[PDB]
Amino acid sequence: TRCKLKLLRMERIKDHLLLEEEFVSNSEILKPFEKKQEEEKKQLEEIRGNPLSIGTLEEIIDDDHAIVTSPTMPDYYVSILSFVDKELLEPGCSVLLHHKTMSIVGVLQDDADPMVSVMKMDKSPTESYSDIGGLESQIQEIKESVELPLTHPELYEEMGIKPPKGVILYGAPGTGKTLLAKAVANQTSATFLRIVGSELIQKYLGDGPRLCRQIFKVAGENAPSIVFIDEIDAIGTKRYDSNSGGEREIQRTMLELLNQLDGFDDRGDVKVIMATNKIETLDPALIRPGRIDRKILFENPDLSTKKKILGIHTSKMNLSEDVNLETLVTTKDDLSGADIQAMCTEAGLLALRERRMQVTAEDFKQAKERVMKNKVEENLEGLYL
Amino acid sequence: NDKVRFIKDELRLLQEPGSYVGEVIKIVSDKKVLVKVQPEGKYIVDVAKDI
Ligand SMILES: Nc1ncnc2c1ncn2[C@@H]1O[C@H](COP(=O)(O)OP(=O)(O)OP(=O)(O)O)[C@@H](O)[C@H]1O
Ligand SMILES: [Mg+2]
């Protein structure tokens, strides 16, 4: 009770006293004039009138005048009045115009776009570290790269190193490249912009360099930022034939992507996470040192590491004392971590058709058979015995 | 009485200033609404006492 009481006692006197102080000060402001404060309010309305016509600021002329483009078509050499600043106006900004004689009377507007919201996420992933079934060291090379300079910049200035930029998460399918990216995306709580690499080829030609440069503009504002580029492999392997600029066009999108990634900009902190399935397909300039400092590799889980993948996934499940978890690992060899997650789901699904909550050893073996048939393995290993 | 009173002053009501139809894009907290009238630019403008 008294813990609430000391806060009550500080907060009441300081705040209510301040409230009283404002009330007296509006009045005192009034005196050298005869009513200054309550008249500034009547003036603002008067100056601006109604309506206010929106324009788009076309170019700003340095003399407290501007050329605004009403979308109705006449352009105007307007004056810049009160309740605005000229470094709050940038070319492109929307302006609020006095109807009778055009003047820039302000812009209190939000000026938000749905174009930016596409870049952004709304989020609370299900993905957290330690849903990673093993490979612990690899977590503490990624976390040393992405998450750690936000927690402490102190280590990196004390050492005198520049904090590492860029990670490439590569290996085989099912090694949880997307699963790491989201586990660290939850923890950091820095604005996590997500963009899938395939959206970077469009149906127009030349829109490429334009789209790419818009990503990094959003990313730059909301500093610090992560830009996650999921499967930047897709653009090199698949040409969709929707782009009229062809093979040429896709190559040009690459080149703007190089400057926006490092370049001459001297933008904010932008870590970049790049998932890909093959790193021998991506353009070598794209991946080159000092713009991608650290390159982590994942390879297939071990006999023990598969045990970890299984505990984390069988834990949600209702179970029997007939379930021998251990014999599902020994039977299954050279299968992904993706296969173990699909195997729990497939057992539960057979169990939902039988109309019971239990998951038996038999629904697990039944499920284990069916997921192993569907994988059609590698011809990479058909050389070898 | 409603019929004859109505036709007679209806003539002054047909000295209309006009109307327009827009649509609410978003509000603002100065009690003003951003409307886009259909073949025209947007207007930041105040509500009457009718809404
Ligand atoms: N090493 C791992 N430990 C635990 N779970 C894993 C691991 N590997 C895969 N998974 C599970 O499998 C799922 C599917 O894998 P994910 O989509 O993360 O893979 P990926 O390597 O990015 O593959 P692709 O490029 O083929 O999409 C994850 O959501 C996770 O549940
Ligand atoms: Mg993926």
From Swiss-Prot, chain A:
The keyword Ribosomal protein does not apply. Pfam families: AAA, AAA_lid_3, Prot_ATP_ID_OB_C. Its main location: cytoplasm. GO terms for biological process: nonfunctional rRNA decay; peptide catabolic process; positive regulation of protein catabolic process; proteasome regulatory particle assembly; proteasome-mediated ubiquitin-dependent protein catabolic process; protein-containing complex localization; ubiquitin-dependent protein catabolic process. It is found in: Cytoplasm; Nucleus. GO terms for cellular component: cytoplasm; nucleus; proteasome complex; proteasome regulatory particle, base subcomplex. InterPro entries: 26S_Proteasome_ATPase (IPR050221), AAA+_ATPase (IPR003593), AAA_lid_3 (IPR041569), ATPase_AAA_core (IPR003959), ATPase_AAA_CS (IPR003960), NA-bd_OB-fold (IPR012340), P-loop_NTPase (IPR027417), Prot_ATP_ID_OB_2nd (IPR032501). One of its GO terms (molecular function) is proteasome-activating activity. Keywords: ATP-binding, Cytoplasm, Isopeptide bond, Lipoprotein, Myristate, Nucleotide-binding, Nucleus, Proteasome, Ubl conjugation. The keyword Nucleus applies. It comes from the Eukaryota. There is a cross-link at K182, K203, K238 (Glycyl lysine isopeptide (Lys-Gly) (interchain with G-Cter in ubiquitin)). ATP binds at G171, A172, P173, G174, T175, G176, K177, T178. Belongs to the AAA ATPase family. The 26S proteasome is involved in the ATP-dependent degradation of ubiquitinated proteins. The regulatory (or ATPase) complex confers ATP dependency and substrate specificity to the 26S complex. Has ATPase activity. This is 26S proteasome regulatory subunit 4 homolog. It comes from Saccharomyces cerevisiae (strain ATCC 204508 / S288c). The gene is RPT2.
UniProtKB/Swiss-Prot annotation, chain B:
It is found in: Cytoplasm; Nucleus. N-acetylated by NAT1. Belongs to the AAA ATPase family. May form a homodimer or a heterodimer with a related family member. Interacts with OLA1, TMA17, and UBR1. Present with 4700 molecules/cell in log phase SD medium. The 26S proteasome is involved in the ATP-dependent degradation of ubiquitinated proteins. The regulatory (or ATPase) complex confers ATP dependency and substrate specificity to the 26S complex. This is 26S proteasome regulatory subunit 8 homolog. It comes from Saccharomyces cerevisiae (strain ATCC 204508 / S288c). The chain holds residues 52 to 102 of 405 of the full protein.
